Design an enzyme around this catalytic site. Structure first.
Site, PDB file in Angstrom:
ATOM      1  N   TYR C  21      -8.938  14.011 -19.270  1.00  0.00           N
ATOM      2  CA  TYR C  21      -9.096  13.250 -20.290  1.00  0.00           C
ATOM      3  C   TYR C  21      -8.582  11.859 -20.081  1.00  0.00           C
ATOM      4  O   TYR C  21      -8.581  11.019 -21.192  1.00  0.00           O
ATOM      5  CB  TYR C  21      -8.993  14.034 -21.586  1.00  0.00           C
ATOM      6  N   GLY C 137      15.752  11.077 -28.950  1.00  0.00           N
ATOM      7  CA  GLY C 137      14.421  10.728 -29.214  1.00  0.00           C
ATOM      8  C   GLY C 137      13.502  11.642 -29.859  1.00  0.00           C
ATOM      9  O   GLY C 137      12.291  11.580 -29.526  1.00  0.00           O
ATOM     10  N   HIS C 142       9.255  18.800 -30.062  1.00  0.00           N
ATOM     11  CA  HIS C 142       7.936  18.991 -29.411  1.00  0.00           C
ATOM     12  C   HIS C 142       7.612  20.283 -28.698  1.00  0.00           C
ATOM     13  O   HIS C 142       6.377  20.716 -29.022  1.00  0.00           O
ATOM     14  CB  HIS C 142       7.826  18.217 -27.979  1.00  0.00           C
ATOM     15  N   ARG C 175      14.777  14.371 -35.819  1.00  0.00           N
ATOM     16  CA  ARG C 175      14.386  13.346 -36.902  1.00  0.00           C
ATOM     17  C   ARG C 175      15.003  14.102 -38.306  1.00  0.00           C
ATOM     18  O   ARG C 175      14.800  15.574 -38.036  1.00  0.00           O
ATOM     19  CB  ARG C 175      12.917  13.115 -36.853  1.00  0.00           C
ATOM     20  N   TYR C 194      14.720   2.377 -30.048  1.00  0.00           N
ATOM     21  CA  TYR C 194      13.837   1.572 -29.419  1.00  0.00           C
ATOM     22  C   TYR C 194      13.145   0.755 -30.565  1.00  0.00           C
ATOM     23  O   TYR C 194      12.043   1.528 -31.131  1.00  0.00           O
ATOM     24  CB  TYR C 194      12.747   2.280 -28.441  1.00  0.00           C
TER      25      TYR C 194
END
EC number: 2.1.1.20
Lengths: 283, 286, 282, 281
Positions: C21, C137, C142, C175, C194
């Site tokens: 994709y 990060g 995930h 987070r 960042y």
């Protein structure tokens, strides 16, 4: 590169073969589910019949027909009933019952036809209107909010309302989603219309998009005759406040309106918390 | 990992909503297609009625009912007919026509019911057998060879045959796939039963696995009477005349009478005329 | 069903052709996103370097490498760093940067290699251990809870922690999902690592199964208007502390950082990230 | 209302997680395949190197790089080579080998970059052109006929030909699909570039649309796991026309047998057909 050599179009059929997904695992169990209509709670029978006759109703429109169990109930009790749905897979069953009962004259004059809420005004020749239009068993909650504003809800409701005669009845319900959302679970087997002869296991998933409840998806896990299978269905979680607003607006304010508890009246902030919310109005 | 959250199971319905794919582009054209039955060829009418009556047939089973256009011709002509199919989308139209014509008594006695070839012995109560069983309009070619040996064909045929009473008829047809494969094209508008009134346009794809023909897939490009161009696709197992003869004969266990028809006209192997359909008609041997 | 006849298997490649994709709408926007992981906040650079030298660390393992931007910062600052990831599409960009800077010797000795959290013990030759293992990060979020018990989280954390030598550091962050869940929104452009200003637009969807938060799915709408989507397991502070401490078997020293500054429970300021720094006792 | 609510977009990645379908069974076996065609036939290396030096080539473009095994052969033999591909999953392996060999100077000067045939003119800076442009191991056959006219083929070949400098070489091959379509089977382990070291097993499926061969789809069964790959079946007449046309007739053209010359209707039937074209301005 990546496109999918399909054998036949989605949505077509051939003569030899079973349709699309008709005899998979999940469809199999879902039939068992839609078919666990057929022991209608006396509670319900008494109320609906009570209401319709207390308001002198005769010409009825059932707009979320399904397998037609409620229509059959009316068709037996001597009302003259038109039933529509947009699902062929479900109307199958209402049509099959009518044909089976074709010798009974009351059933000869039962009308079963195709209709979509978004086009109900040009799908059903209203005429001047129906004495009562019904839409029960939480079916309106099937209609998703595909375009974000609840615009399709608002159109489905104005139209359904457009089927009602002046001085007529719209009876439309929805499950207690105020409860479901605050709990996060949708309890199994509290259907108030049809007692479930079918022991079935439920997982509630709530989707909340940008701080707004958007979908309640239920995965039903039913146990099968003597032989566990799964299927899934989704609902738009109509809260009581909102829906009241929505439905009232569909008549343009020039209505009466009462909200029912589980079948008996509903005072806001009641001791008892209902499973379904029934709305009855008169144009 | 990528766990794709479906909105509802494949194969379910809800009340408000249209079914699964029921009003997509391709489905809408496909209805036009299954619906261009609107003028049955007199050729056909005359043959089928000819055959059935010359063989004294009365109790009929139509096992690939479809929208019921053949069954309706038999009902009307005074036969007593049971029609089955496995497709709800198509039975819809047979049942709708029956209900529309419900006050005509012959039609009150038309039986429409669900049945699958792989389970036809259980699905239909044959009883003593039917006088004639018919499976026309190339419908058997719908059933794919999913396992690889033609085992499911062999079962579907044995079952259909089981529906026929001793001394009875099986009328089963298939398109001339011997021609199709050697040409590579399956010509449009050659239907020998119903002359079509859509200008269908057709692309033929043949799939050949390990040198054995395995599928013939047709992309029909139909019209909207500045009109519309819409497409839909349908596939077929390419039954060669030799193989099918074999297959169907074996379904009776050799205890049969067998003729293969040309286009409705008898068929002499290596004859001048090349037929579009091949009709096989069979008696059991008493 | 019916017999879907795919042109090629899911997951293969041919030579002429772009992969699967790779150049659809969403993919192209997502590259802009992963690539704006850039102008690194001075805040961060000062903290991370501060901490690592503060604890005399030299041998580093970056276990959620990505395009390698943190790895590069360490590589440059003279650390010796091995960086691993399970994503080829992202490692592409760490490898590319290393090759670009191949002449600088400190980069000749940067090691970039493939590794999965569920097999980390067998994928990285952990030797005696690393002086510090970083996973920053919000990358641990995930990893989904595909089973139902958080058993894969438990294994991922147990593998990661097994990369740390005795007396060594694990730095792993997530987070503030306690905030996100109680708000229901995951605010855009608050990446403290960042400075990510780029016109980004965010819709937050929370999935709650049987009363337990199960996914937070974000649809990013970025200015090219294109949208792409990414999802996260909403680790609450309480359960994560639990989880990560258990990965060391209680045998640890543990502090949770505010936004880079320490975190006293029920403090005035509410942090955007929660950084956990863990020292494995010998 | 009937459709998906995917967990993440097709084609994205997150940091923890393996990509899209990267470690499903088929991919796993396919790696074995793309990797275990690597003891390079002496036949081949002698021919290719023979040809390139025969014609005094030095600046090379490998336009279907893959895992870069042909490129590596050139890199080693002292050519100066640019290799491009459109596949990240394959370039991975070329890049990985270069980095592994980074301290050998010829490899330091090997250039590996991304390029698509449909945009090759805008992806690679031809400059004045390359002394030789190679596209071997039947890779052009990967490019499907998606439109129906062979318009994309005609553009890919035009583009590729545009990489060749005047008086330069294009070497482009394709498997003998005239044999394959008349047999209906595409034989296993015939690769004459690389010794087919994996025991495979092959099922050939030909799709013929309206009497024109359109796809040859192979299901490989390796030692048991299965994966599948598809090819456009370029017949010899057609391809000759196609590639000649890409130069605008302004060319010198020879077909090759299996590495030998090919006279039409000769005794031996080749496995691959190699075309070598010389631009003349």
């Amino acid at each position: 590169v990546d496109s999918v050599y399909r054998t036949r179009s989605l949505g077509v059929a051939a003569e030899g073969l079973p349709d699309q997904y008709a005899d998979g695992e999940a469809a199999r169990v879902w039939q068992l589910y839609i078919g666990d209509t057929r022991s209608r709670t006396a509670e319900y029978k008494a109320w609906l019949l009570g209401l319709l006759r207390q308001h002198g109703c005769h010409r009825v429109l059932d707009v979320a027909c399904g397998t037609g169990v409620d229509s059959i109930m009316l068709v037996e009790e001597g009302f003259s009933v038109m039933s529509v749905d947009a699902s062929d897979k479900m109307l199958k069953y209402a049509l099959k019952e009518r044909w089976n009962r074709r010798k009974e004259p009351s059933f000869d004059n039962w009308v079963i036809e195709e209709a979509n809420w978004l086009t109900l005004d040009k799908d059903v020749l209203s005429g001047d209107g129906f004495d009562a239009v019904i839409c029960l068993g939480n079916s309106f909650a099937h209609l998703p909010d595909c375009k974000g504003d609840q615009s399709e809800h608002r159109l489905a409701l104005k139209n359904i309302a457009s089927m009602v005669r002046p001085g007529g009845l719209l009876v439309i319900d929805h499950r207690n989603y105020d409860y479901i959302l605050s709990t996060g679970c949708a309890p199994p087997g509290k259907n108030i219309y049809y007692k479930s002869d079918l022991t079935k296991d439920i997982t509630t998933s709530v989707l909340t998009v940008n701080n707004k409840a958007h979908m309640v998806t239920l995965d039903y896990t039913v146990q099968v005759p003597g032989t566990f299978s799964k299927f899934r269905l989704s609902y738009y979680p109509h809260c009581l406040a909102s829906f009241t607003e929505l439905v009232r607006a569909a008549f343009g304010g020039r209505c009466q309106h009462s909200v029912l508890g589980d079948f008996k009246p509903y005072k806001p902030g009641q001791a008892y918390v209902p499973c379904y919310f029934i709305h009855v109005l008169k144009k």
